[PDB]
């Protein structure tokens, strides 16, 4: 009856407009088509961990305003605990504007709003229910001290943290590498964190390797149509995960899709070895990379394989 | 029953601020979202509403959030909603807007809803329409559709003001002879005449030409200098001047404008002419002073009394 999986992280509205050209400075422009989509990095990873079977709690903070109602709304539709999803009158409920192209470059412009009101008191209000969970799963589009603080309650009452650094500061405060069991960044994101360059998979094992060393149990690093490259404490040569080769019609949010995948593997499935659980992820995301929509292209249970949710014997 | 009816657009505002603009591929972080609501139409018939006119919009929204709070926005200044269409076939009309700290933007308009908004859609409205005193229109619909609004005002002894805004270089010639008030602001006339509009005198020969393409009466908004009319009878340039005032906030001043004076033309129609355009070009400058659009277009209970 009670939550495996807390994610304690963010939810932004996307509102996102197509155009032909991207407008200049001073310019107005027309575009032909605007939509509306439930992002942020934290209620994706929920969403996903949702859709597979797991039960989980978002620890979150939106707006007193339409876009909050919504989103609460959006995380009641995906059997999400909101118990301690926060509104407040103090800022708007988080934004993406995004503006796109015909050949797919975009602008954007993120305005984190009340996903930086959520605080330590919020987070101690839900101790019970993250102390009870299998997995706390964070990123950095909240106050880092906040995500920081959520890993710690998570580590003094045993629960396994999933740690995705994601977007990446260069200067990440250590502590984040040794409060995390499982940490999981993109190509992009090693880079910023390391100062390293990734342009192979072999560049990112050595990616990998300096973030293992900085004192994080598990280091995943995400490769999109690669797969992933994992490293571990025990483990510590690079194994590198492909994945069968799709057409790819949309990727926005597969990284979000991984990582719920891994969080719904690592509370539900403890005993999978961790390069089964990745070839799970992997396959789950490339569902994802399917169909257009972030949260929308994220697949349900009923709708993949069966053996993606059976062990053997062990 | 309703004097004012509007026939035009609804739109969301989104607007970013951030400290500087994107180039292209970047993600960067503002350090402020709002929301507002906006469009042409909306923002004329809320002005003429909150000066006390009993109005009536005439549009389509989404069937969505920004749609179901667009409606909510119009009951909360008493306009009627009875020809305010809902369809699941698009997305109510936005205007995302990115704003740095020195004031230069970036905005993408997808008018969405809007453009469906069609010939049907009037037919049902033909009532409202002939028992009422203005009719007022924009160019952020399709202009057929306005084109009929104007004709059905028309046959019924309405009068018709037309605002061709944004403007279009080759404008079908029946919006001129359809429009009893032609008022659009200084950029404007440059598009649909092809002259240059830096001063007043400028505006005055401007406007001239848009007279002899068959405006009863044409009006030209010039921001802090006030506004030039002429008309079929007095087509001398007769420029009004406007108190000096600290702009804080410009948006949505040619709405206000309009607005007011659909609202004088409704309930004042033995005012003169240049008695109105006082009047508006007062309840304008009002709206400058602060920010948000329609949250600073002013009630009449704030106004001096005449
Ligand atoms: N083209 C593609 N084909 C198959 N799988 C893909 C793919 N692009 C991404 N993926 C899957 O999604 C994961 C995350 O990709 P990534 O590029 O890191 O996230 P993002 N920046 O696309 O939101 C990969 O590890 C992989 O499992
Ligand atoms: N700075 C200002 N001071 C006083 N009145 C002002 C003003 N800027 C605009 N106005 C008033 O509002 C009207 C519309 O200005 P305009 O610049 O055409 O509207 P817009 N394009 O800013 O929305 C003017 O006719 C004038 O009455
Ligand atoms: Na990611
Ligand atoms: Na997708
Ligand atoms: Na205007
Ligand atoms: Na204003």
Do not use: W
Request: net charge negative; charged share 20%; aromatic share 6%.
């Amino acid at each position: 009856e009670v939550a495996a999986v807390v994610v304690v992280g963010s939810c932004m509205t996307d509102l996102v407009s197509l155009t032909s050209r991207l407008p200049k400075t001073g310019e107005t422009i027309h575009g032909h088509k605007f939509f509306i989509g439930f992002g942020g990095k934290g209620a994706n990873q929920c969403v996903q961990a949702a859709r597979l079977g797991a039960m989980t709690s978002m620890v979150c903070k939106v707006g007193k305003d339409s876009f909050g109602n919504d989103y609460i709304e959006n995380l009641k539709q995906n059997d999400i605990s909101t118990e301690f999803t926060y509104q407040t009158k103090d800022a708007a409920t988080g934004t993406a504007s995004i503006i796109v192209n015909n050949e797919g470059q975009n602008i954007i412009v993120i305005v984190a709003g009340a996903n930086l009101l959520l605080n330590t008191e919020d987070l101690r209000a839900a101790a019970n229910v993250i102390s009870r969970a299998k997995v706390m799963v964070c990123q950095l589009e909240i106050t880092p001290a906040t995500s920081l603080e959520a890993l710690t309650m998570a580590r003094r009452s045993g629960v396994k943290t999933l740690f995705n650094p994601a977007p990446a500061i260069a200067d990440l405060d250590p502590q984040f590498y040794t409060l995390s069991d499982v940490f999981c960044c993109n190509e992009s994101e090693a880079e910023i964190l390391t100062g390293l360059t990734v342009g192979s998979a072999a560049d990112a094992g050595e990616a990998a390797l300096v973030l293992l060393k900085r004192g994080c149990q598990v280091v995943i690093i995400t490769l999109g149509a690669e797969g992933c490259v994992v490293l571990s404490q025990t483990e510590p040569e690079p194994k590198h995960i492909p994945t069968e080769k799709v057409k790819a019609v949309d990727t926005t949010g597969a990284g979000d899709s991984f990582v719920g995948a891994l969080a719904f593997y690592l509370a539900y499935y403890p005993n999978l070895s961790l390069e089964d659980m990745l070839n799970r992820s992997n396959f789950i995301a490339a569902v994802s990379v399917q169909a257009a929509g972030t949260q929308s292209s994220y697949p349900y249970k009923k709708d993949l394989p069966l053996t993606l949710f059976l062990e053997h014997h062990h």
